[PDB]
Short mmCIF file of C-alpha atoms in Angstrom, two decimals:
data_model
loop_
_atom_site.label_atom_id
_atom_site.label_comp_id
_atom_site.label_asym_id
_atom_site.label_seq_id
_atom_site.Cartn_x
_atom_site.Cartn_y
_atom_site.Cartn_z
CA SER A 2 8.05 -5.12 35.39
CA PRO A 3 9.40 -1.62 35.38
CA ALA A 4 10.29 0.05 38.77
CA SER A 5 8.00 2.05 40.83
CA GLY A 6 7.37 5.46 39.74
CA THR A 7 8.40 4.80 36.05
CA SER A 8 6.55 6.99 33.56
CA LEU A 9 3.63 5.14 31.57
CA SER A 10 2.96 8.04 29.31
CA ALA A 11 3.86 5.94 26.24
CA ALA A 12 0.63 4.24 26.79
CA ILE A 13 -1.15 7.55 26.31
CA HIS A 14 1.13 8.98 23.50
CA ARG A 15 2.51 6.14 21.12
CA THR A 16 6.29 5.80 20.56
CA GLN A 17 7.33 3.85 17.37
CA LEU A 18 8.57 0.33 17.89
CA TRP A 19 12.05 1.32 16.48
CA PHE A 20 12.39 3.70 19.30
CA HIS A 21 14.09 2.07 22.48
CA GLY A 22 14.60 4.76 25.03
CA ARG A 23 17.85 4.69 27.28
CA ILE A 24 19.42 1.40 26.12
CA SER A 25 23.37 1.00 26.04
CA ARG A 26 25.30 1.07 22.83
CA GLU A 27 26.11 -2.56 23.74
CA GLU A 28 22.65 -3.68 23.81
CA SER A 29 21.68 -1.78 20.64
CA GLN A 30 24.25 -3.94 18.80
CA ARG A 31 23.05 -6.93 20.30
CA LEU A 32 19.62 -6.44 19.42
CA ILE A 33 20.21 -5.56 15.71
CA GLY A 34 22.51 -8.55 15.27
CA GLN A 35 19.46 -10.53 16.40
CA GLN A 36 17.44 -9.24 13.47
CA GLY A 37 20.04 -10.49 10.98
CA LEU A 38 22.77 -7.95 10.55
CA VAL A 39 21.51 -6.71 7.13
CA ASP A 40 22.25 -3.33 5.81
CA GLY A 41 19.66 -1.00 6.85
CA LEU A 42 18.19 -2.42 9.93
CA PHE A 43 18.17 0.32 12.79
CA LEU A 44 16.72 1.54 15.78
CA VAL A 45 16.78 4.85 17.73
CA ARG A 46 17.67 5.35 21.43
CA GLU A 47 17.87 8.16 23.93
CA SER A 48 21.25 9.51 25.39
CA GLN A 49 20.30 11.17 28.47
CA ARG A 50 23.49 13.25 28.88
CA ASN A 51 26.84 14.13 27.44
CA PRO A 52 25.64 14.67 24.95
CA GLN A 53 21.85 15.01 25.59
CA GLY A 54 20.02 13.78 22.44
CA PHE A 55 19.25 10.61 20.46
CA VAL A 56 21.30 8.01 18.80
CA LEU A 57 20.41 6.35 15.49
CA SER A 58 21.90 2.81 15.55
CA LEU A 59 22.15 1.04 11.80
CA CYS A 60 23.50 -1.79 10.34
CA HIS A 61 25.76 -1.29 7.46
CA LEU A 62 28.29 -3.83 6.03
CA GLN A 63 27.57 -6.30 9.03
CA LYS A 64 28.51 -3.72 11.47
CA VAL A 65 26.32 -1.62 13.67
CA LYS A 66 27.13 2.21 13.47
CA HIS A 67 25.99 5.02 15.61
CA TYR A 68 25.02 8.64 14.74
CA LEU A 69 24.16 11.42 17.08
CA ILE A 70 20.88 13.26 16.56
CA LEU A 71 21.02 16.47 18.37
CA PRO A 72 18.50 18.98 19.54
CA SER A 73 18.81 22.89 18.41
CA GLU A 74 16.62 25.39 20.09
CA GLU A 75 15.49 28.34 17.98
CA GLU A 76 12.55 30.85 18.80
CA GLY A 77 11.24 28.37 21.51
CA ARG A 78 11.05 25.38 19.29
CA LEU A 79 13.36 22.37 19.08
CA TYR A 80 14.87 21.08 16.05
CA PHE A 81 16.67 17.91 15.52
CA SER A 82 19.77 17.29 13.13
CA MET A 83 22.45 14.76 12.60
CA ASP A 84 24.79 17.25 10.46
CA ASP A 85 25.00 20.41 12.58
CA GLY A 86 21.62 21.99 11.28
CA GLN A 87 22.49 21.57 7.44
CA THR A 88 19.39 19.25 7.37
CA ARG A 89 16.75 19.59 10.18
CA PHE A 90 13.64 17.83 11.20
CA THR A 91 10.64 18.50 13.57
CA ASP A 92 10.86 14.96 15.17
CA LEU A 93 12.63 11.67 14.76
CA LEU A 94 9.70 10.23 12.61
CA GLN A 95 10.32 13.06 9.94
CA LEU A 96 14.17 12.20 10.13
CA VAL A 97 13.64 8.45 9.72
CA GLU A 98 11.11 8.90 6.80
CA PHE A 99 13.78 11.17 4.91
CA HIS A 100 16.48 8.72 5.42
CA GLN A 101 14.39 5.72 4.11
CA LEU A 102 14.91 7.23 0.61
CA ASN A 103 17.99 9.85 1.22
CA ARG A 104 21.31 8.63 2.40
CA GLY A 105 22.45 12.21 3.46
CA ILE A 106 25.30 11.39 5.85
CA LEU A 107 24.51 7.89 6.41
CA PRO A 108 26.27 4.87 4.52
CA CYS A 109 22.85 3.34 3.39
CA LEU A 110 19.07 3.54 3.47
CA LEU A 111 16.95 2.82 6.44
CA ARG A 112 14.24 0.12 6.11
CA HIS A 113 10.70 0.70 6.41
CA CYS A 114 8.14 -0.57 9.13
CA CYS A 115 5.25 1.13 7.47
CA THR A 116 2.45 1.27 9.86
CA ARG A 117 1.13 3.73 12.72
CA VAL A 118 3.00 1.63 15.22
CA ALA A 119 6.26 1.63 13.47
CA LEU A 120 7.61 3.95 10.46
CA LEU B 9 -7.26 14.14 -6.17
CA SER B 10 -4.07 12.05 -6.88
CA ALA B 11 -2.53 9.19 -5.24
CA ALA B 12 0.81 11.00 -5.52
CA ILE B 13 -0.21 13.40 -2.81
CA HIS B 14 0.12 11.06 0.21
CA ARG B 15 1.04 7.36 -0.30
CA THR B 16 -0.31 5.24 2.32
CA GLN B 17 0.03 1.67 3.52
CA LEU B 18 3.16 1.02 1.54
CA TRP B 19 2.99 -2.65 2.94
CA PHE B 20 0.08 -3.34 0.81
CA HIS B 21 0.84 -4.27 -2.83
CA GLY B 22 -2.58 -4.72 -4.47
CA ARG B 23 -2.96 -7.31 -7.04
CA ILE B 24 0.87 -8.69 -7.35
CA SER B 25 1.45 -12.48 -7.94
CA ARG B 26 2.68 -14.87 -5.37
CA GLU B 27 5.96 -15.34 -7.52
CA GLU B 28 6.32 -11.63 -7.43
CA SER B 29 6.04 -11.32 -3.63
CA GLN B 30 8.87 -13.98 -3.23
CA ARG B 31 10.88 -12.17 -5.67
CA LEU B 32 10.46 -8.85 -3.70
CA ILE B 33 11.10 -10.47 -0.35
CA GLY B 34 14.11 -12.09 -1.65
CA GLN B 35 15.65 -9.04 -3.16
CA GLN B 36 15.20 -7.46 0.07
CA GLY B 37 17.31 -10.04 2.07
CA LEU B 38 14.92 -12.86 3.17
CA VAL B 39 15.15 -11.40 6.72
CA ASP B 40 12.99 -12.78 9.57
CA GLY B 41 9.70 -10.90 9.83
CA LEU B 42 10.17 -9.14 6.31
CA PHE B 43 6.57 -9.11 4.66
CA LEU B 44 3.90 -7.42 2.70
CA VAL B 45 0.07 -7.96 2.12
CA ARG B 46 -1.42 -8.36 -1.29
CA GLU B 47 -4.77 -9.61 -2.94
CA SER B 48 -5.23 -13.21 -3.43
CA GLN B 49 -4.29 -14.44 -7.13
CA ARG B 50 -7.21 -16.99 -7.00
CA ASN B 51 -10.18 -15.83 -4.76
CA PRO B 52 -11.81 -12.52 -5.23
CA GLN B 53 -12.30 -11.61 -1.76
CA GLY B 54 -9.20 -12.94 -0.15
CA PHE B 55 -5.92 -11.31 0.71
CA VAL B 56 -2.54 -12.70 1.35
CA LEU B 57 0.06 -11.99 4.12
CA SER B 58 3.47 -12.91 2.60
CA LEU B 59 5.98 -13.38 5.48
CA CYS B 60 9.67 -14.33 5.53
CA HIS B 61 11.01 -16.75 8.54
CA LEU B 62 14.03 -18.84 8.42
CA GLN B 63 14.86 -17.91 4.75
CA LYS B 64 11.38 -19.12 3.54
CA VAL B 65 8.65 -16.91 2.37
CA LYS B 66 5.05 -18.42 3.51
CA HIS B 67 1.88 -17.04 2.72
CA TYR B 68 -1.20 -16.73 5.00
CA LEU B 69 -4.61 -16.25 3.72
CA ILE B 70 -6.63 -13.27 5.12
CA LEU B 71 -10.40 -13.60 4.61
CA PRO B 72 -13.69 -11.46 5.19
CA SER B 73 -16.48 -12.62 7.60
CA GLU B 74 -19.53 -10.92 9.09
CA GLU B 75 -20.74 -10.97 12.66
CA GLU B 76 -23.95 -9.60 13.29
CA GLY B 77 -23.74 -7.93 9.92
CA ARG B 78 -20.50 -6.41 10.88
CA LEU B 79 -17.35 -7.06 8.67
CA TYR B 80 -14.03 -8.35 9.90
CA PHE B 81 -10.98 -10.05 8.67
CA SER B 82 -9.29 -13.14 10.05
CA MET B 83 -6.66 -15.76 9.45
CA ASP B 84 -7.80 -18.09 11.76
CA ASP B 85 -11.39 -18.78 11.17
CA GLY B 86 -12.69 -15.77 13.50
CA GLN B 87 -10.89 -16.80 16.52
CA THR B 88 -8.78 -13.43 16.12
CA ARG B 89 -10.60 -10.60 14.39
CA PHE B 90 -9.71 -7.23 12.73
CA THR B 91 -11.55 -4.35 11.50
CA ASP B 92 -9.22 -3.94 8.45
CA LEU B 93 -5.78 -5.09 7.12
CA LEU B 94 -3.82 -2.25 8.79
CA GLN B 95 -5.24 -3.32 12.50
CA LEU B 96 -4.20 -7.12 11.70
CA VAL B 97 -0.63 -5.81 10.56
CA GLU B 98 -0.03 -3.72 13.48
CA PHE B 99 -1.35 -6.36 15.73
CA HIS B 100 1.31 -8.89 14.43
CA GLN B 101 4.11 -6.37 14.87
CA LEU B 102 3.36 -6.78 18.60
CA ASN B 103 1.98 -10.58 18.90
CA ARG B 104 3.04 -13.58 16.77
CA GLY B 105 -0.50 -15.02 17.17
CA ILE B 106 -0.65 -17.98 14.53
CA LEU B 107 2.60 -16.64 12.80
CA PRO B 108 6.05 -18.21 13.43
CA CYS B 109 7.59 -14.71 14.12
CA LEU B 110 6.69 -11.25 14.37
CA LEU B 111 6.03 -8.95 11.36
CA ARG B 112 8.90 -6.43 11.42
CA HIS B 113 9.90 -4.62 8.27
CA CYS B 114 7.60 -4.39 5.14
CA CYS B 115 8.64 -4.35 1.20
CA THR B 116 7.26 -1.47 0.17
CA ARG B 117 4.86 -1.15 -2.99
CA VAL B 118 6.38 -0.42 -6.28
CA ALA B 119 3.02 0.93 -7.68
CA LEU B 120 1.99 4.48 -6.53
#
């Protein structure tokens, strides 16, 4: 189905089911709406550029809201943060686990998926 | 040396009742694909997958069998087999199989 030359590395190294790659904002709102538009439904997607990073798309008050997750580089390592480095995470998994019980800058908690295929 | 160190398999609730599973799922919104796994209230070897679909909670029995003396778990009389409950749940996050919809979010366990 994917175009010739597409990277299949996800077969080797598992990405979470809530991680959806380079889908558009509109597509993310369609997907979340399909799951019922209840508080805490979410997915994470990639922004290739402008800014380079990820987007957490989250349902709150029956609206899908979009939060930037941005990389910083310190000492040859990357860290990820939504609040300009006040709270930092080694990867998207750690960020999601934190926000399953802490709101931080988000308006509500993220829901759990609970397994190795989806946190 | 303590269950507080690393709490795993939050989708598994141990010995809670059928009624409690419905209360928990209801409190969380009756969303399609919302689920948990628990022990059967009635047979000592069984487990139950409690899953919400179309605003109704349905309960699917998971039973142990042996093949060549090796153990597996199944909801469909051994047509689809799993090494453990985790493998069964992860499979049905990708394939509906005998279920009316995919497993998506879980209710997490209240006990440690």
